Amino acid sequence: TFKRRNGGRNKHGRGHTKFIRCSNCGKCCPKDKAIKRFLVRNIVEQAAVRDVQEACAFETYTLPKLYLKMQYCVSCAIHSKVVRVRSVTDRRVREPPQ
Amino acid sequence: TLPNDVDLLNPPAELEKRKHKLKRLVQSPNSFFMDVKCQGCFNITTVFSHSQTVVVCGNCQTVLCQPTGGRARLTEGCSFRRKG
Amino acid sequence: VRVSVLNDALKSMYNAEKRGKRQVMIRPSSKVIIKFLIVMQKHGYIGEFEYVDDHRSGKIVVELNGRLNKCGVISPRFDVGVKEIEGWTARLLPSRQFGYIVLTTSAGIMDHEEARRKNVGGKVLGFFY
Amino acid sequence: GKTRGMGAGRKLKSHRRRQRWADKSYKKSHLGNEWKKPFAGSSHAKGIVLEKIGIEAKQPNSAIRKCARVQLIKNGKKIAAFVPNDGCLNYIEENDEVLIAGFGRKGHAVGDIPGVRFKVVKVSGVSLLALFKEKKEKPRS
Amino acid sequence: GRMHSRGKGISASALPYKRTPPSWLKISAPDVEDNICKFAKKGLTPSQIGVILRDSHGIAQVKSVTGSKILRILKAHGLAPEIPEDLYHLIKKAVAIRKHLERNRKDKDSKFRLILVESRIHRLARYYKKTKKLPPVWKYESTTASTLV
RNA sequence: GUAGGAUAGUGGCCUACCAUGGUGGUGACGGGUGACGGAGAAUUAGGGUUCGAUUCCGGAGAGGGAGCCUGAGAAACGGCUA
RNA sequence: GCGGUAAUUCCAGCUCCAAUAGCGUAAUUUAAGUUGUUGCAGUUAAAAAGCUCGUAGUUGGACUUUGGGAUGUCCCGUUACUUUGAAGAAAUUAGAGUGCUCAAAGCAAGCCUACGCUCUGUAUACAUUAGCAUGGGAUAACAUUAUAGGAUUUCGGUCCUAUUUCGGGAUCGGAGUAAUGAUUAACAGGGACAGUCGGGGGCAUUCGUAUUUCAUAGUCAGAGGUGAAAUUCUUGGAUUUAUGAAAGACGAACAACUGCGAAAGCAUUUGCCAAGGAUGUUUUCAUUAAUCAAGAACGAAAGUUGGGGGCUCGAAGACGAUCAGAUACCGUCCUAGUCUCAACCAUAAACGAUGCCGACCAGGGAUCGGCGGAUGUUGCUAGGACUCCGCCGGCACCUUAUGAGAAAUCAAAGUUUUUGGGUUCCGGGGGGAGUAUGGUCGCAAGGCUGAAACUUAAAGGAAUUGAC
RNA sequence: UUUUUUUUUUUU
Ligand SMILES: [K+]
Ligand SMILES: [K+]
Ligand SMILES: [K+]
Ligand SMILES: [K+]
Ligand SMILES: [K+]
Ligand SMILES: [K+]
Ligand SMILES: [K+]
Ligand SMILES: [K+]
Ligand SMILES: [K+]
Ligand SMILES: [K+]
Ligand SMILES: [K+]
Ligand SMILES: [K+]
Ligand SMILES: [K+]
Ligand SMILES: [K+]
Ligand SMILES: [K+]
Ligand SMILES: [K+]
Ligand SMILES: [K+]
Ligand SMILES: [K+]
Ligand SMILES: [K+]
Ligand SMILES: [K+]
Ligand SMILES: [Mg+2]
Ligand SMILES: [Mg+2]
Ligand SMILES: [Mg+2]
Ligand SMILES: [Mg+2]
Ligand SMILES: [Mg+2]
Ligand SMILES: [Mg+2]
Ligand SMILES: [Mg+2]
Ligand SMILES: [Mg+2]
Ligand SMILES: [Mg+2]
Ligand SMILES: [Mg+2]
Ligand SMILES: [Mg+2]
Ligand SMILES: [Mg+2]
Ligand SMILES: [Mg+2]
Ligand SMILES: [Mg+2]
Ligand SMILES: [Mg+2]
Ligand SMILES: [Mg+2]
Ligand SMILES: [Mg+2]
Ligand SMILES: [Mg+2]
Ligand SMILES: [Mg+2]
Ligand SMILES: [Mg+2]
Ligand SMILES: [Mg+2]
Ligand SMILES: [Mg+2]
Ligand SMILES: [Mg+2]
Ligand SMILES: [Mg+2]
Ligand SMILES: [Mg+2]
Ligand SMILES: [Mg+2]
Ligand SMILES: [Mg+2]
Ligand SMILES: [Mg+2]
Ligand SMILES: [Mg+2]
Ligand SMILES: [Mg+2]
Ligand SMILES: [Mg+2]
Ligand SMILES: [Mg+2]
Ligand SMILES: [Mg+2]
Ligand SMILES: [Mg+2]
Ligand SMILES: [Zn+2]
């Protein structure tokens, strides 16, 4: 039985899509199928922000940010709980969680 | 428009104009011929609205229109009148 | 490609009648199509139809009464003798009380009852009821 | 889709002719292999009893089905034939003359008996049915 | 659809219902034939002649004023080309593709396109042989195709 | 194809000479058939499927080939010759 | 399916049931719409060739004389097909008549007893295809059309023949007559043209960090890796830090329910070379078309032969772990390979598990390319960017059933027992088996084509409940 | 993300 209309990927009007390597296990996975997340977080964790600011060597300074694009295979994405198994009706929802 | 709300033999002119030229009840082109005059020369030349060639006035040897993807673009100086 | 203009016309009328449309469009036109429509109109299965001239094959707009259950083409156009009409009607028509098979005989395009009356055979064009 | 041309009768006939071979019943009766089988297209065949054999019944049943190894006289082929009815194997002896019939499923095994397609009808010219009901007696010689 | 692709475009000309010349047009049929013959002598194909007439001389359709097609007029004056224009252009395209392939052996796409173009050439040439627009001995050969043009 | 021979007679049926022809995916040629063909038989919505050694019609054979006399008629076998 | 110590199923008794002078058992028809022309299937049940071209075959748009007056009748090249007729052994089949006692049958027979009669009867129908003759001229197929060498009247020159100057020919010219002779241009197709568009193809040519190695310099005890370790590298300085060089791969982020390509596939710049769809077109040709045995072009990855390269990763192999074992999963080092050229190979869950062409068929919002119209801005140079309304073409998506379906689902998997638009391929319960054999291609690996004996009651699809 | 192998035949 077929469970997804898109077959678990995002390929339309296309023959082949080159793969990426899973950021967790290194497994090959088509890019249109890999679960991709973009993480933008402060280099200094919120706990240490005050201590680092108190030790600033300049009158003013804005702490940088860390940018990471994570590309997971299906297995790692499920195991890491990046995505979860949804009900038959709920897995047709494509909007990101609020 | 709902099918029973319109007459296939007497469509409103707006709908016929909006339709594709080949999909109208009777095929009719959207092109036309125009009388183009240069800015300075009294000579008057007929030009196709969708000319594929650079029409040049014989007297002053000036380009009247430039071919494009669709309708030809006239030179800024020249003006045209719909001929038909 | 377009192989049977009559098939396209009849299929358009059938689909429009099923949908409930009061009018349908037939393109291209043909004299076989016109004869079929005249046979249908003779028996009250369609209203007035109008031929539109476009310096090409033409177009027809047909009024639909709502009495047409199904009109269809038969392909290939099999040879039908005067003795095979009974079998063809049994195969194609819902009942012996109503329904018509359109044939093309050397005497012209006509329904099967008229063909029986004139004792003329030909080739089967289609059916309607 | 199907071909429908009025001049396409040859193609339809040829396609049906080619596709008939996919039918197992048609192929069985048109390949000419019935003549290489033990009966060679006959309802019955006579043979000589070589040995009595017991065949275990198939799951979920448990029994010893009594059968005889018979060599057909007309071609020398060896087959296994079931001996029906209670204690009817006692009417069979080695080197006896037996008439063999099909098991009813046209060359296929029947019931819980594996790989047996034949049964014994007569022994020494006397039907097994008569022997079972004591209507007749097996000839002494 | 397209013969040698999956394109389904419907872009085409829409001839007007009116078959008569416009009132503002004043040129005469013999004059139009004279210009057509002059253009053909200058080395213009019927398509080019029609395009030039429409774009410059205000002649939307030559048949409207002359009553006949451009190629018919050219033939009546002994000016029609030995081989038809469309077949000529197809052969020109084939020659160009073969010339390109002579220096690009790894260009397999060009080989595919050459196969398609030569299939088109052969089908069109067969049609023209059926209608006696080419001599029965005519045959397209890749080796000496460049000579034909 | 020409001219002959032979035949009850046409015909490469055979001979001499001449020409290169003839058939074929619209399946030639080759192979299988537990294949004599038909009138017919079984079953029957219609279309079809299967069978047809056997008393009527036509053909062929007389253990296998071949040759032949007699005769209007046979390449006969309840005729002959090898 | 019965039988394992309470057997409606075996062996028996009784009783009962079906047919009945018949009944049981062991090739072929029906049922089988499970061979499907009528009339089946091919997304997941068995199934559409990886993709395109293409000859045979099949199929192929529209257009040429209608009407009234009247009354079957008057006025303005070759075939298919259909109607009718002849002819077409009997027996058999259907069928008329007839009390062999009935019947299967047979072709008999009936009145009355007349030295007889019913001329007693012994009908009639059916009969594929092919052939013969006849009426029709719708639908179809083949052939033809315009370099007039055309049709027709008359007349001048040339060449031959017959019945009693003449008739019949066979050619060469002058003149005349005429409405003088060419359907349209398919929301068919090809071709030309214009501005475009694209990660389509080939060749050449810039760039990028990273990896490994090396060179220089600095510091000193660990570094690496794991669930935890060890193999391993390390005071001959590992790892780490800065600069630089070389080599070979790889082209991140941008990058998408986006694009191009027949498919496979295709993502750094710039140039060159041919190619292409869509759009626009009052340009051209005029049926040139659709789909396709045979036969061809291309065809991921792996693999093969020989060069060049050989950074990384890494089949095989070797070690270290884990384990009862561990020929593995985990770690460490590595050959072939991974890259490129020349030549092969031709297979993939080569997938949309869904042939191509054509028509119709609900709604909606997005998006890519082209085009038309309107409108207001831009730190810009009429244009470009954005906004709005439309047309064509494309990749898709959402809702819905009046549709289909075994459902899952599908806006095509719809317009199908109310069954027929054209055309190619291809399946017929499960195994044996994609095996044997033969052929053919390949260096090889193997590819293509492709059985049978025998075995078996299920295998299998979708969905429901429970259990896990 | 250490490690976790197995449960005679028929029938209920
Ligand atoms: K799928
Ligand atoms: K995904
Ligand atoms: K058992
Ligand atoms: K049992
Ligand atoms: K195509
Ligand atoms: K176009
Ligand atoms: K003779
Ligand atoms: K001869
Ligand atoms: K015979
Ligand atoms: K005699
Ligand atoms: K007991
Ligand atoms: K008991
Ligand atoms: K029972
Ligand atoms: K290497
Ligand atoms: K290795
Ligand atoms: K263990
Ligand atoms: K290979
Ligand atoms: K797939
Ligand atoms: K769109
Ligand atoms: K048991
Ligand atoms: Mg599942
Ligand atoms: Mg792929
Ligand atoms: Mg095609
Ligand atoms: Mg189209
Ligand atoms: Mg002779
Ligand atoms: Mg017989
Ligand atoms: Mg026999
Ligand atoms: Mg006998
Ligand atoms: Mg006989
Ligand atoms: Mg004889
Ligand atoms: Mg004998
Ligand atoms: Mg003898
Ligand atoms: Mg003899
Ligand atoms: Mg005898
Ligand atoms: Mg005799
Ligand atoms: Mg008991
Ligand atoms: Mg009992
Ligand atoms: Mg089936
Ligand atoms: Mg499966
Ligand atoms: Mg399947
Ligand atoms: Mg497949
Ligand atoms: Mg092929
Ligand atoms: Mg037609
Ligand atoms: Mg057109
Ligand atoms: Mg460095
Ligand atoms: Mg892009
Ligand atoms: Mg980049
Ligand atoms: Mg090498
Ligand atoms: Mg390594
Ligand atoms: Mg390789
Ligand atoms: Mg395959
Ligand atoms: Mg746009
Ligand atoms: Mg099977
Ligand atoms: Mg164990
Ligand atoms: Zn992973």
Automatic annotation (TrEMBL), chain A:
- Native organism is Nicotiana tabacum
Keyword terms of this UniProt record = Ribonucleoprotein, Ribosomal protein
Q: Which GO terms describe its biological process?
A: translation
> Which first-to-last residue range defines the signal peptide?
none
GO MF entry, a single one: structural constituent of ribosome
- Is Ribonucleoprotein one of the keywords? yes
**The keyword S-adenosyl-L-methionine appears for this protein:** no
* Residue window of the full protein shown: 2 to 99 of 127
Q: Name one GO cellular component term.
A: cytosolic small ribosomal subunit
Q: What lineage is this protein's organism placed in?
A: Eukaryota, Viridiplantae, Streptophyta, Embryophyta, Tracheophyta
Protein's recorded name:
40S ribosomal protein S26
Give the protein family.
Belongs to the eukaryotic ribosomal protein eS26 family.
Automatic annotation (TrEMBL), chain B:
**Entry's cofactor comment:** Binds 1 zinc ion per subunit.
- Please give the start and end residues of each transmembrane region: none
UniProt keyword Hydrolase present: no
User: What keywords would UniProt list here?
Assistant: Metal-binding, Ribonucleoprotein, Ribosomal protein, Zinc, Zinc-finger
BP term (GO), one:
translation
Family statement drawn from the similarity comment of this UniProt entry: Belongs to the eukaryotic ribosomal protein eS27 family.
Name of the protein in its database record: 40S ribosomal protein S27
Q: Which organism is it from?
A: Nicotiana tabacum (Common tobacco)
Q: Which gene encodes it?
A: LOC107765692
UniProtKB/TrEMBL annotation, chain C:
Which Pfam families does the UniProt entry name for this protein? Ribosomal_S8
Q: Write out the GO biological process terms.
A: translation
Q: Which GO terms describe its cellular component?
A: cytosolic small ribosomal subunit
Q: Which PROSITE patterns match?
A: RIBOSOMAL_S8
Listed HAMAP family: Ribosomal_uS8_A
GO-annotated molecular function? structural constituent of ribosome
What name does UniProt use for this protein?
Small ribosomal subunit protein uS8c
Question: What PANTHER family does the annotation carry?
Answer: 40S RIBOSOMAL PROTEIN S15A
What's its job? One of the primary rRNA binding proteins, it binds directly to 16S rRNA central domain where it helps coordinate assembly of the platform of the 30S subunit.
Similarity section: Belongs to the universal ribosomal protein uS8 family.
UniProtKB/TrEMBL annotation, chain D:
Ranges annotated as biased composition (Basic and acidic residues)? 20-29
In which residue ranges is the amino acid composition biased (Basic residues)? 10-19
Region feature Disordered, mapped onto this chain:
1-29
Gene3D superfamilies assigned to the protein according to its UniProt record, in alphabetical order: Nucleic acid-binding proteins (2.40.50.140)
Keyword presence, Transit peptide: no
- The superkingdom listed in its UniProt entry is Eukaryota
* GO biological process per UniProt: translation
Q: Which Pfam families match?
A: Ribosom_S12_S23
Cite the SUPFAM superfamilies for this sequence: Nucleic acid-binding proteins (SSF50249)
| UniProt entry keywords in alphabetical sequence | Ribonucleoprotein, Ribosomal protein
| GO molecular function terms listed in the Swiss-Prot or TrEMBL record | structural constituent of ribosome
Q: Name one GO cellular component term.
A: cytosolic small ribosomal subunit
Per the record's keyword annotation, is Lipoprotein included, yes or no?
no
What family does the Swiss-Prot or TrEMBL record give for this protein?
Belongs to the universal ribosomal protein uS12 family.
Q: What is this protein called?
A: 40S ribosomal protein S23
